[PDB]
Design a protein around this nucleic acid. Structure first.
Lengths: 136, 171, 197, 97, 191, 106
RNA sequence: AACUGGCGAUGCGGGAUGAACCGAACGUAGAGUUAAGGUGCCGGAAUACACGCUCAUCAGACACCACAAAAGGUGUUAGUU
RNA sequence: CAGUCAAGCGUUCAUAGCGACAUUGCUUUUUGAUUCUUCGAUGUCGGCUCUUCCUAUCAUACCGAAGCAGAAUUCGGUAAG
RNA sequence: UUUGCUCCACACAAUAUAGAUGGAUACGAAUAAGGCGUCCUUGUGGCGUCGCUGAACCAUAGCAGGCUAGCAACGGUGCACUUGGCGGAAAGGCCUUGGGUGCUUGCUGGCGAAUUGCAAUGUCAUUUUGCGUGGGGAUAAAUCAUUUGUAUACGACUUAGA
């Protein structure tokens, strides 16, 4: 019988790793780790998502599962071309993390009338769901 | 605060016997123009026979980094005074700009030798981009081919005092 | 915000938790702290035992019954830290210390209610990996607390009952999901999703 | 300055306060540690101290100079009529005792 | 200085399997199964092809990269014990009083009994760890063999005998009496 | 239905004070849900009521009110400064005040 | 005993406490801003941000000031041939 | 009272035990130096009595080291029970 | 000894709430790891997915929530009852078994609201009782004085006395 070990792989930081900056001017935009300065600093670029090419602490950014092939220290135009070719933006949008962010934005965006509409529809769905519970 | 780099050119005060003195230049890492001029006069007093009263400053200019968004290696030769003597040290660091390089060099000197700003002379900052010129292993370590590492044990900051589920440090 | 906040003391650094809870009690929040025997203190167990022995050495010379009362239970140790963090000799401090309640394990009123954590006090988040720590129950039994085993037994029984309750709750939630998946993906659900819910 | 000559303290500090007991009847503070294997049994009895008298008995310790020699010993007599069992109480263990 | 990545390779023979949960290592092989907790080490594991496992520390100090190779050697020890086993041979050194060693069972626990150590009336009792087998080896006078899988328990039982046989109130440079480990090897060596 | 609350909840923390002297003319108010001065800037100028009850009827009610107003922010953590027509009675350190939504600007 | 500044003769904020230190000197009030000192809780104010160093079986913790030395240590960190 | 360095002593051998010439220190159980408190008074030497505390440990517990064969010693550690 | 003492309500009547104004919303555990779902070798695994904060979840529309008419629906839910229990750490809480009653905003109608005047908390929840009312219950001790001496300065303390 074979030996088993728990793989325990977690979101390496490397050239091409897509990050979601959480604080600062960008604060919610996607960037690519273009180079690793240090254990705590990497050079990132966000030409598609609106992040200027800048050095940043990894404390400011959040590593995302997305990664695309990108040469180390590639310029903004090349990072841009490779980002487009790999189609990382729509892949990010498809994720439930980005879906969670967009859902939270929409919920904060509702108005009072839309909150009343949400109440009405939620009461309806609750009635039908508990009816299905009773009948099933 | 944020260090800037200034080119400071100054001369001895021209006399009738000797018009147009030799007009020496330095590169000074300093917080602002006032401290840049003060450090220029400090070092000029250290090298040649001239002081602020006996000379004048003909130019002060911010030297912006040529490519401030590229990663290069920096060799910094410094001279600093300990509690017992004067020592020259050489350290190698990684940054995008020379000014931030010198800023974190000052932080490093304060942290590892308790050397304050006053007791440090930045002898030289040289940019090297070719490996096998880097000598420090703590820079050669990040100079690795196709380097990649994880960040285990992620601690997420909470704005609310109370959390309702036990935290996870996965990353 | 809440009538009472109940804090799972497990994994919490005693000082950070005491500071948080003292600020809350002075701000007017009722707080119950459970699992005090699972509170942590940074540093080696021998070190904190030496600290408690230094505490024990202090007593009023001419009458030891007037001196500092060195309480031994983990809940009482946490309470002593918090009373040190509160201005306890004024009526406001007495009101805050009345607002506080702390227990070993989880008594019957609170084993059936929600328990929260304070992430700015949790050891797993605060202490650097590889730093030694002690457990309040282990220190307390080392210095004279007599109920490490009674509390452990009652904790095992309570955890067994709570795990059975959780299995039942999972089953009910899963069956609700299975039965209402048929009613899911409906027009009302689509409208709610468009609205953001 | 120090005590000129060292002597032990007068009395035992562990029998304090040297005050009156709360009752004549001295309750058993601690009972023998329980073990489930042995049969059920009482661990105490109640008697009345009647007085002291003397006994003569042969002493048997192999190595004393009074071995197998008679010794005169003081004894205390406790009159112990059989006690009536009227009731029982059960104690649940709690984190407070 | 926070070495970014230090990793070592633990080799796995063709007959043994290592099952490693979070930090609970279990090595199974021809001789038996050995379990070790490593929750105090803060290390990571990655199996390569079932014949090698890489043990790694990311961003560790000197005192962390030391513990990395320490746990690699501990896993070496467990694998070696499960494959070949450990055999500790100890001799009896006595000038006048011969050491009398026996194996006794008070409530079935296989205590080792030492008598007449420097001719005293005290009997020195030492328990045997689980998985440690005691054998009074023949063909050599005053030799005892301690065999097992866990080198930790085998060596600790040998140390227990050696420690219980200390000489007191005498010059131990002259009174060389005692049971000393003379051989540390393998049960199935040269097989 | 069961909720009629038309105000935000808050706590009266203390008076404006240094280490060793307090100023009863200014009260520190924490607004529940607010943890930054940026978010507390919404409540600047909003009216506040400390509502309490007495055992004696005054003018047809056993409930008395002390009105006040959020004047500015206090610190980096969403606490604000408030001023009341009568200083809060200092037994209410940690008591509930009602931060109304008027005078409204939304 | 020195060019001085203070206490005495002087409260106030800070140094926990203190005649002299730091800040600043005083009519009775109200807003704002600060000094010195501080912002985990006591306690008003960031369990702020950033880079390091340190783990002590007597850690350390901010001047006056309420103390420690010579000599040592493959503890750990950074520096020439 | 305790360290640091070792020229030497210890038949050889600086450091088992010592240790010169130097030098760094530790609460004040000495005695000085000072004159801040008390001269509209803080009852003084010693002893007796009694409690407690310190440790720089004489003994007792357990150890390390010897120029520790055994006994007897000597040098140190945790130790004031 | 005028109606005593003991388990709920009311024309009525304290120092007052250290301070409700929709909900204190229940798994061990680990964190260099886990939560959930599924699969297959009587096997401590494979596979998929999630997290990146509670900004959540549940509750929430009606005179502080009135009076009323219908529509596929047997649901959801507040209450006088009945049936299993479970819970001793400080259990004082959780469903159900069934009968009765009231709302239902799940989807559609009809009437009412002003005038508190342009806001004023605009009054809605609690360790006690009483000449009082009713669904029901039994008529105890302590102490002083006497005595005692296993106690004792005095108090207290072991005792006794229809």
């Amino acid at each position: 019988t074979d030996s088993i070990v728990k793989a325990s792989n977690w979101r390496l930081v490397e050239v091409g790793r897509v990050v979601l900056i959480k604080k600062g001017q960008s604060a919610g935009k996607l960037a690519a780790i273009v180079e690793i300065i240090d254990q705590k600093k990497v050079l990132i670029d966000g030409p598609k998502a609106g992040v200027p090419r800048q050095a940043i602490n990894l404390g400011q950014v959040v590593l995302t599962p997305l990664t695309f092939a990108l040469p180390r220290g590639a310029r903004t135009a090349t990072v841009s071309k490779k980002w487009a070719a790999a189609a990382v933006c729509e892949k990010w949008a498809a994720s439930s993390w980005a879906k969670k962010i967009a859902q939270r934005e929409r919920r904060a965006a509702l108005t009072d009338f839309e909150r009343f509409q949400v109440m009405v529809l939620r009461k309806q769905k609750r009635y039908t769901v508990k009816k299905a519970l009773a009948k099933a | 605060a944020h260090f800037k780099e200034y080119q400071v050119i100054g001369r001895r005060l021209p006399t009738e016997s000797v018009p147009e003195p030799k007009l020496f230049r330095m590169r000074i890492f300093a917080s602002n123009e006032v401290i840049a001029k003060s450090r220029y006069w400090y070092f000029l007093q250290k090298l040649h026979k001239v002081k602020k009263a006996s000379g004048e400053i003909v130019s002060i200019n911010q030297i912006n980094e040529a490519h401030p968004t590229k990663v290069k290696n920096f060799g910094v030769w410094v001279r600093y005074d300990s509690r017992s003597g004067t020592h020259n040290m050489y350290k190698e660091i990684r940054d995008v700009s020379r000014v931030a390089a010198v800023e974190t060099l000052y932080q490093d000197m304060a942290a590892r030798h308790r050397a304050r700003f006053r007791s440090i002379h930045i002898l030289k900052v040289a940019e090297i981009e070719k490996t096998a010129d880097v000598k420090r292993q703590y820079v050669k370590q990040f100079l690795t081919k196709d380097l990649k590492f994880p960040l285990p044990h992620r601690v997420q900051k909470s704005t609310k005092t109370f959390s309702y589920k036990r935290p996870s440090t996965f990353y | 915000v809440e009538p009472v906040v109940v804090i799972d003391g497990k994994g919490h650094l005693v000082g950070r938790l005491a500071s948080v809870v003292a600020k809350q009690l002075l701000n007017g929040q009722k707080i119950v702290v459970v699992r005090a025997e699972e509170l942590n203190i940074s540093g080696e167990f021998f070190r904190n035992k030496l600290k408690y022995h230094d505490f024990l050495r202090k007593a009023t010379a001419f009458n030891k019954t007037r001196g500092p009362f060195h309480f031994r239970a983990p809940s009482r140790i946490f309470y002593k830290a918090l009373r040190g963090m509160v201005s306890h000799k004024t009526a406001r401090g007495k009101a805050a210390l009345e607002r506080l309640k702390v227990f070993e394990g989880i008594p019957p009123p609170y084993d059936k209610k929600k328990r929260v954590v304070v992430p700015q006090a949790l050891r797993v988040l605060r202490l650097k990996p590889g730093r030694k720590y002690t457990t309040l129950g282990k220190l307390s039994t080392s210095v004279g607390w007599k109920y490490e085993d009674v509390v452990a037994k009652l904790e095992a029984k309570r955890k067994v009952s709570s795990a059975e309750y959780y299995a039942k709750k999972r089953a009910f939630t899963k069956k609700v999901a299975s039965a209402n998946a048929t009613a899911a993906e409906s027009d009302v659900a689509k409208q709610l999703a468009a609205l953001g819910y | 300055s120090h005590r000129k000559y060292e002597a032990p303290r007068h009395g035992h500090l562990g029998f304090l306060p040297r005050k009156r007991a709360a009752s004549i009847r001295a309750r058993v503070k601690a009972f023998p540690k329980d073990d489930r294997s042995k049969p059920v049994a009482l661990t105490s009895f109640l008697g009345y101290k009647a007085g002291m008298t003397t006994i003569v008995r042969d002493l048997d310790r192999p190595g004393s100079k009074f071995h197998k020699r008679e010794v005169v010993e003081a004894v205390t007599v406790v009159d112990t009529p059989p006690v009536v069992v009227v009731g029982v109480v059960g104690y649940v263990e709690t984190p407070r005792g | 200085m926070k070495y970014i990545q230090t990793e070592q390779q633990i080799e796995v023979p063709e007959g043994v399997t290592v099952s490693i949960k979070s930090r609970i290592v279990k090595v199974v092989g021809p001789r038996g199964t050995l379990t070790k907790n490593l929750k105090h080490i803060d290390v990571t594991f990655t199996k390569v092809n079932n014949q090698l496992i890489k043990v790694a520390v990311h961003n560790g100090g000197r005192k962390h990269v030391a513990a990395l190779r320490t746990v690699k050697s501990l896993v070496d020890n467990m694998i070696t014990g499960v494959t070949k086993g450990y055999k500790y041979k100890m001799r009896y050194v006595y000038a006048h009083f011969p050491i009398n060693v026996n194996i006794v069972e008070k409530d079935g626990a296989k205590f080792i009994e030492v008598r007449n150590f420097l001719g005293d009336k005290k009997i020195r009792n030492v328990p045997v760890r689980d998985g440690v087998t005691i054998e009074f080896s023949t063909n050599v006078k005053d030799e005892i063999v301690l065999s097992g899988n866990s080198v930790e328990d085998v060596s600790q039982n040998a140390a227990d005998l050696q420690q219980i046989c200390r000489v007191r109130n005498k010059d131990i440079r002259k009174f060389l009496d005692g049971i000393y480990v003379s051989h540390k090897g393998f049960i199935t060596e040269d097989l | 239905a069961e909720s009629h609350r038309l105000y935000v909840k808050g706590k009266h923390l203390s008076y404006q004070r240094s280490k060793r002297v307090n100023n009863p003319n200014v009260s520190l108010i924490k607004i529940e849900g607010v943890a930054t001065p940026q978010d507390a800037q919404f409540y600047l100028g909003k009216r506040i009521a400390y509502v309490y009850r007495a055992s004696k009827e005054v003018r047809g009610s056993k409930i008395r009110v002390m009105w006040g107003k959020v004047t500015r922010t206090h610190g980096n953590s969403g606490v604000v400064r408030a001023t009341f027509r009568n200083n809060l009675p200092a037994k209410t350190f940690g008591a509930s005040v009602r931060i109304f939504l008027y005078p409204s600007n939304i």
